[PDB]
Design a protein around this ligand. Sequence first.
Ligand code: CL
Ligand code: CL
Ligand code: ZN
Length: 492
Amino acid sequence: GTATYFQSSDEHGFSMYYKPQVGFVGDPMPFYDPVAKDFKVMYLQDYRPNPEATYHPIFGVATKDGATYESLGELISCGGRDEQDAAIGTGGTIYNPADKLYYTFYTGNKFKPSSDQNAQVVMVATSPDFKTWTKNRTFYLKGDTYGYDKNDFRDPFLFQTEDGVYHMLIATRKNGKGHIAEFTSADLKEWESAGTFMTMMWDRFYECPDVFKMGDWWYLIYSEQASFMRKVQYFKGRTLEDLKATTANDAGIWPDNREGMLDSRAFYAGKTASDGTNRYIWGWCPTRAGNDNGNVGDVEPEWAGNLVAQRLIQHEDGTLTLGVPDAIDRKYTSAQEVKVMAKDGNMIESGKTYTLGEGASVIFNRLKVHNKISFTVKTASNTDRFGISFVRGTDSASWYSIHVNADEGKANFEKDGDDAKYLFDNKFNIPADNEYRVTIYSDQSVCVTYINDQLSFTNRIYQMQKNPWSLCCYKGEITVSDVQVSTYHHHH
Ligand SMILES: [Cl-]
Ligand SMILES: [Cl-]
Ligand SMILES: [Zn+2]
């Protein structure tokens, strides 16, 4: 009925983009449990603030589908203040059918290490049922034992190849240069160094590496540590040696025309797992200081937030994009009436289509709490620009928009209105036919925008829930059609 701004909040609760009752979701460690036939997503549990020295214990959630989550609680606790794993960093899980134990390798971060100590050491815990985890008190894998780094030696990724060999990939350095080191084992207990799997481009550092085969392609997914990037990226190759060659001697053989950038700065630490039908990626969407959508960090965003699952889309040429998990899409079952609450500028309404010239905007009726928004936008030219706006009340001085800038080949997240400012961007393939098929899935303040199976754009938008949303044209002219909204909760 109203289209004024309302001060919504996140206390109502999340659902598909999970958050624990207390704290926030840091780096996830997804794993397909071959016995339970579901996904176990371990994750670094973050608190605001964290204790000194002993922080980021490993908690877990279980999910069949990336939409419905069961809390598993604390699984691997921090070591004591003075122990090697006082603070725990990211690792990886794998099942061993020979001894029927789950193995989780992880990073032990020493508090205030001395010259002779290692800031980071890879350690392990096992469990027969995924509920009770037992640390191996004699396993300590040190980078400098094998010529790698004493202090950067982290994020172990585990996979078993078809020949039965277990592989562990660890993000580290050799003589300062970033190296993903490989170790091999027959039993997950005794390990040998296989040298360097891949070097990291230039002075980059690849957090949370993830290597897998999908169809006829091998992939490395990683999260760039460099502050100017802070995005999930990937490389591809038809063979493992082709994959490893993409960065050899800084070759920079990008997998596609966007340096393999899958999402932008509000989706981080993405790693994958497959149930044999779909391969999903789990990452986190950061919180914002003061819950201010325009405070995205001076250098890097805040660390940790909400768990976000996406589905890998493999294209005929082997490139990857991300789409919504089908089970998330199916959560939005309650169709809502779509009504125009406000129009401004040079535009025309043609029934259930709207054509907006430069400067024009249409405001639609208030969203609910967990929303699926869909519509089609056709631009007049391949250099036009349009906006998808949230938290835009008729009385709002500022709001937040995804700018789709066809002339620049990318979508931006920006603050609009008073104190407008560009925040970050997300390159994607512009449609030759100028048609943009848009879907947005939201869960309170977390949403992902998908376009044409090409763009996947996660954003933190506090108070998008229970507030109007809007479409606008910045440059050129657009026609909006087929506007639909469906919600999670059902009313009568
Ligand atoms: Cl809802
Ligand atoms: Cl309900
Ligand atoms: Zn709800």
